[PDB]
# Entry
Amino acid sequence: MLLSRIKKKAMELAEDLKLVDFSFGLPYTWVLVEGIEGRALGVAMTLPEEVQRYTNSIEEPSLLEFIDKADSLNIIERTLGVAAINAVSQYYIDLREAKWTELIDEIKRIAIIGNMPPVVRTLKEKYEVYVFERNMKLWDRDTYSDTLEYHILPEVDGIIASASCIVNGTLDMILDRAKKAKLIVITGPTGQLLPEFLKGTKVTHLASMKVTNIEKALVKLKLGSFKGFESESIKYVIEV
Amino acid sequence: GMNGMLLSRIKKKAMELAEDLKLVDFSFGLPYTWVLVEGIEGRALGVAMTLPEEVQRYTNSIEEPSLLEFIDKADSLNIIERTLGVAAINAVSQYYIDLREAKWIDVTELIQQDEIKRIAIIGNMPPVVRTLKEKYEVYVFERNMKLWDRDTYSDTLEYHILPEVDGIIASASCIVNGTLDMILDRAKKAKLIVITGPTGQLLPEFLKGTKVTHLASMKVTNIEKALVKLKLGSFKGFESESIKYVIEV
Amino acid sequence: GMLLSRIKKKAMELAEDLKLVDFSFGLPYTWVLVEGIEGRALGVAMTLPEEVQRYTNSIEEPSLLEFIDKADSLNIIERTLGVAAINAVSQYYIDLREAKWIDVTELIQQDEIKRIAIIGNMPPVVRTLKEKYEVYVFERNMKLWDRDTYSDTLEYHILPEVDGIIASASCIVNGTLDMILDRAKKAKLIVITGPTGQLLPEFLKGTKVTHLASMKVTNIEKALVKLKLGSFKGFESESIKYVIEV
Amino acid sequence: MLLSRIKKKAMELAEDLKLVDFSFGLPYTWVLVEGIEGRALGVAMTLPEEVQRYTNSIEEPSLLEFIDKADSLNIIERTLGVAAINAVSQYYIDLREAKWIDVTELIQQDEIKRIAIIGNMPPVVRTLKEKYEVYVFERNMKLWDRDTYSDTLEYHILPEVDGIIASASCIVNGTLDMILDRAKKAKLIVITGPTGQLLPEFLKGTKVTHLASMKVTNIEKALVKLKLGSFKGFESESIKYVIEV
# Structure
């Protein structure tokens, strides 16, 4: 599992960081950390439809304990672990010259994992697009089942996968089936991880967002507002 | 919002009690949304079950969070605003709750104390269902597909079956989704109506005049340890830091 | 005291000279084909798989009277086949002389109706009314969730505040029709729209329902092919939409 | 896709067969065919939770047209196609070496330790959970348990199991290709259910070891029960078999 290798690298970076606060909440599970330079907020998308039991083996919460359960069979332990990996990453992230869609000549067929209407509408006009959605709420008249990813991914030149593919563990399959993909973009707040963690993989770019105001974003994360949390952050694209 | 709700009348009573209380912390999280409050006597933790299957959008009109702002949004069309509002009503209630005449029993024990023939169980609660299905005629209704059995009926059949039952055990989550008003209206022949679960932390005086007879809920004994488990998404961890009670209305 | 229990009693009196030809509990619609001295009639009801408890049926010997008698059953499979049979008998005897060949949107008037409750997400109807009226859309199925759609648990509280109601005819199969009419306190216009609304208007006499917006199958053979193939638009193209006043 | 290769072989066998009747219905989609020897009924499990739109490109229904749409991106076209492949298969099926046993008795303690069960089958799960290490995966929320896991974990758990009991519905949703690719250490792979009516020769070369399905003994009585939406009524008009691939 790729998430098992990412947590090993992240635990080496969490040595000088401490856990401040956390919450397995909606729409995002977040982990607040603190170092000598200041604080950092890491998030991971909560997928309640994947939750089988509301249990957690973690008795004493800590940053190293959260990161160690990132490859757990328990989705609650994974989401808190990925959020913690992102929290350590957002503390050490270098976004100096980070690019702001026009990232895609070269590409003819695109596979979009996770229904993102603004991204889909822009690409459906100029490229052959295949949208895959698992959640029934985000279903369009153009969306296909996620069971068809295994068969369509080897035929596409570009892949735009929702960063939620990291928490549900579907990232390992997406990369394995990306036989002919020249571009693989992991987009969303769950993609807050360091690009060095994905070195060697087929992932080409990471499109996420860094929290500019931790206090205001925490208020919006606790209130369950995605746009409110998004407005307290800056969107970035960094090459792996 | 929806001023016709029983929840619209409960928030009006709760806002009069939230005058000497302040908001400490909150979280729209899983399995429960919680609101932490503080008064002159100490702190109180109120919870309200999060129903993600009811969430259509992740939006919130609340810009400046406060205890009175949360309670005012209890009768909102937005489930996120309702859940945070009900958790805030429960927070205020848990600060002022008097459990002198509270019975330290299970909901199944409470039913056995009366002469019931047919029971309607709203919300699939396996321990409660298993105990009652062997001694009474039980009708289980579940809205969430995850908690669905081969013996659970659709919630659309509640409207037709509730007038035929003598007892009702409704999951306290009927307060956050807005089904409580219908359940009580259709409870024509029911002599025993129990609202069970941590979302039922509300004061019994708020349900005065309604057909609700009992409130089966739990009070947090250790706020710090229960918050750790609520943030970790562990229900039994939060349940172990609380005491279950059954109180008359 | 369900409304569907009273409709089946009236429909069984009309199914005396009709015989069952074929049937199918299928998707998107359950259908029942009947035959009389004048010819054949096809009746449909919307299959709601999310409501299915167990794939069981107490009917051993299928007949038109047996199907109609199980229209008020607790089993959704028996209800859907029963409603489809009631519609099949209705489509044989339906009189569309004074039926209006109009859309549901042009039926409502700005003169009095200020608030509209739309039960079942119908994008063309919603888009037209949302720009001129205060609209409240309620959807139970997650597949049909928009940026304006709300939960069906809020119907009980919002229906008493609306002047007009446009309810999907699927409210007849899941048994939500009885509640919708009870909570329609201030509604002056109640329209039951969809292929499940093929039942006779006389069956809804006395109720708060004002209009029935449905469709009559013009080509039974071609529509059956499209019903068996699972195509809604293919079956819709082999029918004619009508608006009949109750 | 494996279903794209199965339809090519099934279309060669549908030459002397004709379409009689069909229905995309619940619980099963069925296709009724006829040849010189008689009639055959093929079924495929309808998965309404997978249906996003109720559309079908098929204008003129035929046996070859149904089979050609078996690898379609449209679940309605796939289910009708798989039901048609099963209908052609049930006409040519040879059950001389078919075992009249349950899927549970096909597994022995001396060879298998970890079992992966795809599709929540309570009788099969209850029998195996007491003697083996079982991992149940369910995609439909209705058939979900506090003991079942998400289908996203199949990709990671399937390479660790000795045996696999997959619901034949994995053929219609399109998960069969992944299940077999992730069956790295599996010595036994059983595709169980009425959707597994297909010929064993179609799965020759694959990791699939057995096919546990059923053959309709009374077509008329089973059609009445399929149209009525009764699974047990249709099951009682059939005979369960286990044929080795």
Remarks:
- Chain D has nine helices and nine strands.
- Residues 2-245 of chain D form one domain.
- The CA atoms of residues 100 and 241 of chain D lie 5 Å apart.
